[PDB]
Amino acid sequence: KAVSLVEELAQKRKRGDSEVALAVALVLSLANKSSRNAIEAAAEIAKRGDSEVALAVALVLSLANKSGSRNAIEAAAEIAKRGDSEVALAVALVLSLANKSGSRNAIEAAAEIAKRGDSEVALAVALVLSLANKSGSRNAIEAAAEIAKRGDSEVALAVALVLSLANKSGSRNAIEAAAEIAKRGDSEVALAVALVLSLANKSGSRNAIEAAAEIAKRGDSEVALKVALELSQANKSRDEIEKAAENAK
Amino acid sequence: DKAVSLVEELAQKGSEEAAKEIRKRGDSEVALAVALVLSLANKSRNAIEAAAEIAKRGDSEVALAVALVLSLANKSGSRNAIEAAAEIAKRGDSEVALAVALVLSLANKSGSRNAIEAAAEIAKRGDSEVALAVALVLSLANKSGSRNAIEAAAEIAKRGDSEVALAVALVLSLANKSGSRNAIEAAAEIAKRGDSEVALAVALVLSLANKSGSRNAIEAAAEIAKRGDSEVALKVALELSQANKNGSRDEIEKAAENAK
């Protein structure tokens, strides 16, 4: 029967694998209601006969119609032509997260990442998006959009570190400053701060963590590294962690 | 019509009604999606039980993500990964299913069984942030083409720490853009070590070396990475950062030699 649904949707088998059959029906059912290139791409997948790939494409395609951005529909077509499940999935995440983002910058950025089709960028962007969506600050979501727009794997990975590290500190000041760093959008500041926060949390001193949030807010790359040095060596005297924290204050 | 038929036929087969609801809505994407979800459940008990929750939801995005994770749980052929996928299907969060799909898919394409073992663990923990961060380290190890990095990625994935994975994926990524085979070589050494403070401190140096655009700086940075001394990376990072700000092409090469 599945071949019938794929055959009807195709026309409008010899292998006989249900999943592939249904999977492709999706790829064609989604293409036929979309972009001439989209329909053409969906066909190429059907000829491929890959269970995993057909779904990822349909998924990126399903997410392409939800945003509406034809650039997303056209970008999904090229990913369908590339036929790499890694690229499709990572773009699915960025697209899915941009939709749940509630930001048109994020949606516009996500479509841009789809065109470029860089797997590494989309995943790192999807991280920064996943964190901004959980942070609950309108400014952070736009910071992520700005980051995703730049299409830089390093800033996304450096900012995601800072956001992730702040969320584990439970310190509103640290989170407040973390969103500030994403706005600034500087890879060198985020990493220098990512160290400080990482080293404060590991030392497990609220005064160290809050001192770090102070450093982050100030956003002075050299100062974070100076404290990172002072904080690192103490980690290697609970009496002393407070000293370097106060000094950083 | 066939969509509701295929879903209904598979729905009759020990299913827990929902098919009538989906049929009443008459959405193909949801219908084909759920059909795939149930089809994958039948051949695979909690999965069959879990798939019904998806069917009643009538959500196109979740059904595919779940079906995808299910499809990959079959190709891995690891029972633990099947059960893990069922718990994710019970949640019905397309984000977790997607991020886990990647880790599972990337672990399958890696060829390391430690990795596939790890990928299954990630599905059980169902941590959206860890699955993505690991997927990075995995995606980067599969592209590096050094069997040790893949096993390094498996170890990282095994520990289930988003910080170490994000710090390591940073150095690996930073090394791949350096074009320096020794930097890439040292980057694989860092991931094996598995130290977050070391990788970050090194990620800094590399970030600064690449930015300054001095091959001496990069090769010096790679030397630092090989040593793996966190305190020494930050010292050079400070010396390197301040040259990147002034732009003294004569100075950058000076602090690069100092790092040796």
Numbering used by the authors:
A (entry chain B): 8 to 19, 33 to 54, 56 to 257, 260 to 272
B (entry chain A): 7 to 19, 21 to 23, 27 to 54, 57 to 272
What did the study's authors say about this model?
Here we describe a systematic approach to generating modular and rigid repeat protein oligomers with coincident C2 to C8 and superhelical symmetry axes that can be readily extended by repeat propagation. Repeat proteins are composed of an asymmetric structural motif that is concatenated several times in tandem within a single protein chain. From these building blocks, we demonstrate that a wide range of unbounded fibres can be systematically designed by introducing hydrophilic surface patches that force staggering of the monomers; the geometry of such fibres can be precisely tuned by varying the number of repeat units in the monomer and the placement of the hydrophilic patches. All multiplexes follow the naming convention CsHRN_Rr where s is the cyclic symmetry, HR stands for helical repeat, R is the number of repeats in a single chain and N is an index to differentiate between multiplexes of the same symmetry.
We also expressed a C2 dimer directly as an eight-repeat duplex (C2HR4_8r), and the structure by X-ray crystallography to be close to the design model (r.m.s.d. compared with design model = 3.78 Å). The twist of the crystal structure is approximately 22.5° per repeat or 16 repeats per turn, and hence by propagating this structure from 9 to 17 repeats, the angle between the N and C terminal repeats can be modulated from 180° to 360°.
